[PDB]
Write a protein that binds this ligand. Structure first.
Ligand code: HEM
Ligand code: HEM
Ligand SMILES: Cc1cc(N)nc(CCc2ccc(CCCN)c(CCc3cc(C)cc(N)n3)c2)c1
Ligand SMILES: Cc1cc(N)nc(CCc2ccc(CCCN)c(CCc3cc(C)cc(N)n3)c2)c1
Ligand SMILES: [Cl-]
Ligand SMILES: [Cl-]
Lengths: 362, 362
């Protein structure tokens, strides 16, 4: 059963991948080889060409992603050779460095050895490789509340945060055969951060807001032809709203809208003044302005939606069905100002793809 | 078959309606009466109590409506006695007057005789009782593009618009047995309109925008216990975003965002300036301000979402399942600033309800 799942998934992937690569004639022989290998070993090993194209397909099939136009230029780093925690740490440090690329962000994925018997070889605990800690001790809230449980887990293992609102969490991952994960403090030279200022309102700097340059999702599983790559961190560049309308704005995150309203000099007293809406717009302008000013890649939601329209056209033109999650594709700011809002999307799951998996803590 | 549909729907409705009315014991006798009546006549007639509560239930079950907190105070006008076009016209005029209520809008529905053999007794052509005409002659666009096809149909029947951007369409409806609908110009004394000004920006009046006070949806079918009330116009008061973020903002409607940007004194050149977002916020502030200043009921999307939260709690507290369409419930401005955005809703259809029906023109 488990291996029939593998063979069926392998069949579909190799056929599809090789068609896209103009390698359709090699499918028959390659499947024989794969079938023998599953027979003789219980699994199979992707060629580097398969691995790279599979990761790209997986991005292409990510229903919730507005940035998919650029799927085919994903920079895929093959790290299936890794066996030690030093090698993992160094691969993660390297991913941060090459993806950041001095601000000119490169969409990158580093792929670690896949699950064996559903047994992980490398288990990453971080949600993102770069993220801020969060604390909640006796009524006082510090940092990013979304990081509270991971932060508590790190502090169990002998890490201690400075309890600033922007403590960088350490890298934390466990190796197969180890009982506890290890942690490593991020070298600050690796991590670009951007201070948030506003183009016109000088007082905006009084909020002392900042955010990190590169979102590197490190807790999803990449699945390709029945192989489960549970550890495969990937990054793009930010869409501004992710920072200005969610990370810094949500009541359950940094919750900064009342403070924004005060520095931009409007009252925060009446719903009918639309002060939250006005504060959201200004904070979002500041975020775009700040990233651009520092030379760190970022895209606004209008340009993003325009790019996504092109992805849609490209898919049609290539004869591929389009899939999407409307509820995630619409930006959280002026959604009806984008074309996305005014059409519908088929939310079917197509593989290869990226999937949620259970957290190893909490 | 057709009558088995009717009896099954009647069974479910009478049971449910009478439970809610504390009249559970009368269900058995009432169903016998109904069953005989379908047997003897092919249909049945609602008591006034059933009709009123059914219309209220229908509002309660409208998945796409954020305003449902107030379902139980709907003002139901029973006009099943109507037989002539003068009576229909007068009932429609009356609905406008009593719903408008000098600006203190009353959620109201007027219910006309239901379909007989799927044969309409009264067929209303208007989408809303009050709406602006739209024209598109040889490249030049005037008025509301959404009204183009109905406007063309009216002008076929000998009506002529002044071709202002805000021509009030005439009431247009057809009677059973008539080949053509009739039309009647709206008395302007009946129709409250609001000029759009901004609380701080004096130049905003230069846009000469306005909108009508009361949205009265007149093209949906109310279904109650298997009876099809195809003509049953209903109204609430506006949520500000419907006007500021859609009617006046959409590129396929009045398309005013570039003009808004100019009068509020910002450039409309770069996506990263979020000029569309900023223009949307200011236009939406102006709309709320203008309605409030004139004494015409309106609700902002924050207050609306707060009221909807109470509807949710009320439903749970009453032991009723909640249904909703997330894609319509989220406001088109700052949706993530409402609780709606952060939860999910079951989009199942529960009856009684309001349903789309085919337009009799186009
Ligand atoms: C190149 C720049 C990119 C941009 C601007 C972008 C934009 C976004 C945005 C805005 C979201 C939505 C998050 C939310 O709604 O809060 C998202 C989700 C997602 N993106 Fe992208 N993205 C990019 C690159 C990538 C890459 C390189 C991958 C993987 C190879 C990827 C895969 C995904 C996935 C899987 C999700 C869903 C995450 C989840 O379900 O939690 N994206 N993207
Ligand atoms: C009391 C004030 C009311 C407010 C503020 C309100 C608010 C809204 C809003 C914002 C929409 C969405 C339109 C859109 O997304 O563009 C809507 C849709 C709807 N509302 Fe309400 N509403 C109210 C009263 C009513 C009443 C009295 C009824 C019927 C008895 C009703 C039934 C509906 C229905 C059926 C829709 C869906 C229309 C469609 O599918 O095209 N609402 N409402
Ligand atoms: C690779 C990449 C690039 C980029 N610009 N953005 C992303 C998405 C980042 C991200 C990270 C974390 C999260 C939190 C939940 C995921 N377990 C999210 C999604 C946030 C969200 C929350 C809600 C309530 C709705 C919604 N649509 N989206 C999105 C990935
Ligand atoms: C009774 C009532 C009160 C009130 N405040 N609002 C309404 C809804 C009015 C309305 C009128 C017309 C329409 C146009 C289509 C309906 N055939 C709409 C819905 C507009 C819309 C468009 C799009 C693209 C998405 C969306 N969610 N909603 C909404 C009814
Ligand atoms: Cl993020
Ligand atoms: Cl409307």
């Amino acid at each position: 059963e488990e291996k029939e799942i593998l063979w069926n998934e392998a069949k579909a992937f190799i056929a599809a991948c090789y068609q896209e690569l103009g390698k359709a004639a090699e499918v028959k022989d390659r499947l024989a080889d794969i079938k023998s290998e599953i027979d003789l070993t219980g699994s199979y090993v992707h060629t580097k060409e398969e691995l790279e194209h599979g990761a790209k397909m997986a991005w292409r099939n990510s229903n919730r992603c507005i940035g998919r136009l650029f799927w085919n230029s994903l920079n895929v780093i093959d790290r299936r050779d890794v066996r030690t925690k030093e090698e993992v740490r160094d691969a993660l440090f390297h991913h941060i460095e090459t993806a950041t690329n001095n601000g000119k962000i490169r969409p990158t994925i580093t792929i670690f050895p896949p699950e064996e018997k559903g047994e992980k070889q490398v288990e990453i605990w971080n949600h993102q490789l770069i993220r801020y800690a969060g604390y909640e001790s006796d009524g006082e809230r510090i940092g990013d509340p979304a990081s509270c449980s991971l932060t508590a887990a790190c502090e169990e293992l002998g890490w201690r945060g400075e309890r600033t609102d922007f403590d960088l969490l350490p890298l934390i991952f466990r190796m197969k055969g180890d009982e506890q994960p290890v942690w490593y403090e991020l070298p600050r030279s690796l991590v670009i951060e951007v201070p948030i200022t506003h183009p016109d309102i000088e007082a905006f700097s009084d909020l002392e807001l900042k955010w990190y340059g590169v979102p590197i999702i490190s807790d999803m599983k990449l699945e390709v032809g029945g192989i489960h790559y549970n550890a495969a961190p990937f990054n793009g560049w930010y869409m501004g709203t992710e920072i200005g309308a969610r990370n810094l704005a949500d009541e359950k995150r940094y919750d900064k809208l009342k403070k924004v309203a005060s520095v931009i000099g409007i009252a925060a007293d009446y719903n009918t003044d639309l002060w939250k809406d006005q504060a959201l717009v200004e904070l979002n302008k500041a975020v775009l302005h700040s990233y651009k000013k520092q030379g760190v890649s970022i895209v606004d939601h209008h340009t993003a939606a325009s790019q996504f329209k092109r992805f849609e056209e490209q898919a049609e033109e290539a004869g591929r069905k389009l899939t999407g999650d409307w509820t995630w594709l619409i930006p959280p700011i002026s959604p009806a100002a984008t074309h996305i809002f005014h059409r519908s999307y088929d939310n079917s799951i197509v593989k290869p793809n990226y999937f949620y998996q259970d957290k190893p803590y909490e």
